[PDB]
Amino acid sequence: KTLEVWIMPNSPQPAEDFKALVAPFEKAHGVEVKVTVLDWGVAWTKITTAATSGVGPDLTQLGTTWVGAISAMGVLEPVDDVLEALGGEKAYLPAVWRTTRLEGARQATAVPWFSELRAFYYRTDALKAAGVNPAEMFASWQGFEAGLARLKASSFRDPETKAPLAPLCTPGRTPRTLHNAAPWIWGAGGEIVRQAGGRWQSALNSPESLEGLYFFLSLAQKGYVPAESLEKNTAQIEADFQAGKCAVFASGPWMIQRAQVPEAKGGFAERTAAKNLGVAPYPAGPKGRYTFFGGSNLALFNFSKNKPLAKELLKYLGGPEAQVRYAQMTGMLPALRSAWSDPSFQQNPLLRTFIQAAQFGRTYPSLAGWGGVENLAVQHLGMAWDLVAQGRLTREALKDLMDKASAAINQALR
Ligand SMILES: OC[C@H]1O[C@@H](O[C@H]2[C@H](O)[C@@H](O)[C@H](O[C@@H]3[C@@H](O)[C@H](O[C@H]4[C@H](O)[C@@H](O)[C@H](O)O[C@@H]4CO)O[C@H](CO)[C@H]3O)O[C@@H]2CO)[C@H](O)[C@@H](O)[C@@H]1O
Ligand SMILES: [Cl-]
After folding, report:
1. Secondary structure (DSSP) of 119-143
2. What span, in angstroms and rounded, lies between the C-alpha atoms of 150 and 152?
3. Sheet bearing 248-251, strands edge to edge
4. Residue 80, helix vs strand vs coil
5. How far is residue 31's CA from residue 25's CA, in Å, rounded to a whole number?
6. Number of H helices, E strands in the chain
7. Atom 22 of ligand 1 has which residue's CA nearest to it?
8. What 8-state DSSP symbol labels residue 288?
9. How crowded is the C-beta side of 353, counted as CA atoms within 13 Å?
10. Rounded Cα–Cα distance for residues 307 and 182 (Å)
11. Residue 325 in 3-state DSSP?
């Protein structure tokens, strides 16, 4: 007898780690769990085709930002029962509980699986040399800039490469998401969409949203991000950091894990970067301190022929023991608030910085149309990055691009 589960690649050998995780459940319930791994790049299409066709697995992983769109299709089984058995609303951060439903829905359609948020990895060796105090560089936008300026000047060189380091690496290729940009929007007092006057509307062209975007994009334009980083995507920037080309880059907690895995195992423990690794939160902007808070949930399709067994599996995967074990293999944080006290999270000084940074975690609203909003936003942001590649991103050029993005988002939202 067989349960089918789709996941994304959350760990170096993602199917083996998932199968190890569920072996106790399989033994206790007389069932086999067959897992399929979908790359993040294609998972949306396969999940959407499963949703409209009625041909799919019992359970799928969903990125928290996808729950609303899949739930609005009317294909997910209610899971209020599972969430109650896990301890209900009080067992989760509000930012995690919001991702359990479509915004405004009265019924839960996803079970929190793991959480992740974004912070700055830095080279302790590169900053020590450049004379940069990390507590100062990551406190404020002002500090951040002054720190990249000291890093750009530095004669420091990677021992493996023998070359200087880029102060900051961030991808300039049209992004899949706003996860890199949203902290700058939010720190300025901006937002992507805002609910006001009975309706959701774009806020990407607000003065605050434009101030934060322009701060971020202009770092690349003032030589803090080398030309070659503007031509790279998130994956090619991670590789660059691992290989000693970057002093500072923003990512999720999984880099700590990858950094303890040898290069032969899909990791980078033997590189200088892994041996000189610091983590610092996003700096405070003029209007506050925010980072992207994300993660993945698990949903049950309402056409599953195995709903009872699937719900025992969601309860298993959602519960404390499996929450710690899966976080240990993935480098993510558990979804369940209580599981953060595990010594495996509290005795890792880099992970404790992510834990502290979650106070400033901010999530997107769980809207049916969220994918189309982010898609329109990233297409226009990619045009702004192409102006950066020319030295021609002006406050007026950014505003005209974000005015076109707002008109097309406002259009999509009605
Ligand atoms: O927008 C959709 C959802 O996004 C979730 O964030 C995901 C993110 O989209 C995804 O791209 C990211 O995947 C990383 C993966 O890129 C990384 O890859 C390794 C690679 O195996 C290795 O060869 C290379 O050298 O290094 C890379 C870095 O280690 O692997 C890790 C696992 O080890 C993946 O997690 O993961 C993000 C977190 O799941 C959002 O969280 C969600 O809110 C959103 O809806
Ligand atoms: Cl927002």
Report:
1. EEEEEHHHHHHHT--HHHHTTBHHH
2. 6
3. 248-251, 119-123, 277-280
4. helix
5. 8
6. 20, 12
7. 266
8. B
9. 20
10. 37
11. helix
The position carrying tokens 């569920």 is 22
Q: Decide if 44 contacts 371 (C-beta within 8 A).
A: yes
Entry resolution (Å): 1.9
Q: Please report where in the chains the tokens 């301190």 appear, as a residue.
A: 289
Dihedrals phi, psi of 355, to nearest 5 degrees: -60, -50
* Residue 250 contacts residue 219 (beta carbons within 8 Å): no
∠ at Cα 50 (46, 52), nearest 5°? 115
Tell me the C-alpha to C-alpha distance, in Å, between residue 297 and each of 41, 101, 118, 194, 406. Answer: 17, 10, 18, 24, 29
**Distance from the alpha carbon of residue 10 to the mean position of ligand 1, in angstroms:** 7
Q: What CA–CA distance (Å, rounded) separates 11 from 260?
A: 13
Query: Which residues make up the environment of ion ligand 2, defined by Cβ < 5 Å?
Result: 191-192
334 touches 340 (CB < 8 A) = yes
* Atom 39 of ligand 1, nearest CA residue: 295
Ligand 1 pocket: which of 13, 40, 277 to mutate (most atoms within 8 A of CB): 40
Residue 239 Cβ inside 6 Å of ligand 1? The answer reads: yes
Q: What are the structural domain ranges in the chain? A: 1-117+292-366, 118-291+367-414
For β-strands 193-196 and 199-202, DSSP reports them as antiparallel
Residue 48, both tokens = 């959407």
Residue matched to tokens 């969409």: 193
For this PDB entry, the determination method is X-ray
Tokens linked to 20: 């190890």
